[PDB]
Design a protein around this ligand. Sequence first.
Ligand SMILES: */C=C\C1=C(C)C(=O)N/C1=C\c1[nH]c(Cc2[nH]c(/C=C3\NC(=O)C(C=C)=C3C)c(C)c2CCC(=O)O)c(CCC(=O)O)c1C
Ligand SMILES: */C=C\C1=C(C)C(=O)N/C1=C\c1[nH]c(Cc2[nH]c(/C=C3\NC(=O)C(C=C)=C3C)c(C)c2CCC(=O)O)c(CCC(=O)O)c1C
Lengths: 303, 303
Amino acid sequence: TNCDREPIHIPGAIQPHGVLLVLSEPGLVLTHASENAPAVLGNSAEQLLGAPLGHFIEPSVREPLEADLRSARLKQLNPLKVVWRVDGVDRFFDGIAHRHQGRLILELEPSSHREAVPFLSFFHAVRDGLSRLRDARDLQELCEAVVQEVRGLTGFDRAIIYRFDAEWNGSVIAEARDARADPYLGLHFPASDIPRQARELYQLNWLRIIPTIDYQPARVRALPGHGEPLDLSFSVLRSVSPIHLEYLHNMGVQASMSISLMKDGKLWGLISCHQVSGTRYVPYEVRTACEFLGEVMSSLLAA
Amino acid sequence: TNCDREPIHIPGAIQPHGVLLVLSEPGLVLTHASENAPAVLGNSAEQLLGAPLGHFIEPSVREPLEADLRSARLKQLNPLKVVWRVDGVDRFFDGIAHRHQGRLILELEPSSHREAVPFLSFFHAVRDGLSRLRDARDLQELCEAVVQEVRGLTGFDRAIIYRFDAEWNGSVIAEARDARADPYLGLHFPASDIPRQARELYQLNWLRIIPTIDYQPARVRALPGHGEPLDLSFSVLRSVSPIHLEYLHNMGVQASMSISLMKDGKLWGLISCHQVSGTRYVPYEVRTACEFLGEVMSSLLAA
Ligand SMILES: */C=C\C1=C(C)C(=O)N/C1=C\c1[nH]c(Cc2[nH]c(/C=C3\NC(=O)C(C=C)=C3C)c(C)c2CCC(=O)O)c(CCC(=O)O)c1C
Ligand SMILES: */C=C\C1=C(C)C(=O)N/C1=C\c1[nH]c(Cc2[nH]c(/C=C3\NC(=O)C(C=C)=C3C)c(C)c2CCC(=O)O)c(CCC(=O)O)c1C
């Protein structure tokens, strides 16, 4: 048994700082809604399950949202602009929608505290970041550039490159840190700290974020006949394995984010980030800029 | 003599669809203004020369603009938001500012016809583009990906990869085209079609755009004692060599854009684009996304 066996892709629950919905196609009837919807959205699961999405959307953004949701080109279209009209009182969300195993999953995170131009911060992050990565003259300089850039953009206490060896053991080959975070640079860890089914999932889904390791999972409720494990492999809000939360607690880490580094189709390593005290809800534009930099680094892993 | 000798970096004039200003430091007094300022800005050179920039800027965007102009971090801060208050009647511009040879040059192009979210189109362009470039499995697939993406983003009739050989002759090794543009794929051209001082300039300044080859150059006027050739090497609006305009006329090309491809610090090739009929004022976000893709391709020129 041991670590390789837990089915981390179907926990039945999400991290409660966003809301997860499942939408029928083509009608966009909600078949599933996470149970934190009252706190986040201002509606109960009973109001949600079996209602059409449009009923809750401010009418002027409604048709474009529905058009996007039916597009597949789906992302490419993320993030979706979601204005949730309840009281109302519009609430604003970035929607991240994806299709997996026959389900259309729409995840809602509250739109950033504004106020700077939308997507300007992404524009600058990836331009400045690309040119620092291109200054690197070898693999070690690349790693140190990436970790400095990611720590700069996010404000995480620690950011490392964690490289896998042939046996899937890993080592900390680059680190940028606040002084206040103990230095992990140079440490090697056994393969079971990132077990096989996690590594397999992380070859497909290149980003995970845990803005606080102390949260109450919000169960995903479903219409009768629906529900039945929801495959959450590509869902950003997926509740993470409790044994990993305990590992982070024991490391003394309150919040985490990691990004897969790919090479020739195979997981090569991770950019891994920790907040040592306090939480870390990384804004959408920052997270996405960091993933973009990880894709650039992955493409450069030919030098 | 021949082609290598013309001093293309100091033509004394600009392409008239934007305005070029030179600003003193730290006071931001205009020492130079291109003579098309009446058409573009609504002020004469006489009103401009020796006035402080702030006098013309809408007061609520004035302090941040001046702060940026004095920053160096200068870009990194481009584009600058420039609201020009004359009549007034605000007019809106993207400012591209740079320092070169001791001058602070501010170039003003009219802000795009709006209306979509600012920088959203850049966000999508570089994300979708990066993932198509990463699908390429060899140099030829890379070239064909780049040319398809750039043509898709811009709408140019033709987009090619033009690769330099050891003697600086070039060949068209990839092409995407409207059918209506003759195919240049496979053609080789002599080194003098892109002469030595152009190639040297294009190792430093990675983008040039000619939205119409038929334009009246707008001379750059200067305060007494100033003026004296303005080095326009890094200026986007720099008027281009008339012999090159004739070459484009003769190719049957009405508008052009090219991007340098760099490898190990040396010019490797160009992404070159043509509009065969009609003009092509590529919006700022599109141009900048194309340059970003050229930087990615340049970084990948290790495979
Ligand atoms: C057998 C069970 C497990 C033991 C024992 C253990 O130590 N982890 C077990 C299961 C497990 N881990 C993860 C995900 C995971 N683990 C890491 C490990 C590290 N983070 C670091 O910074 C370092 C070294 C400094 C190590 C080593 C990481 C980065 C991750 C990814 C998640 C994150 O970024 O925090 C999982 C999967 C958790 C999930 O996706 O649900 C499991 C089951
Ligand atoms: C000796 C004078 C010149 C002769 C003869 C000639 O043919 N060109 C001469 C000078 C010259 N060229 C350029 C810039 C330039 N030339 C090219 C050439 C090509 N564009 C194509 O698509 C192809 C093949 C299909 C060729 C070959 C290009 C791309 C450029 C860059 C400008 C642009 O993108 O249109 C200059 C410099 C012009 C300037 O920067 O002021 C000069 C002096």
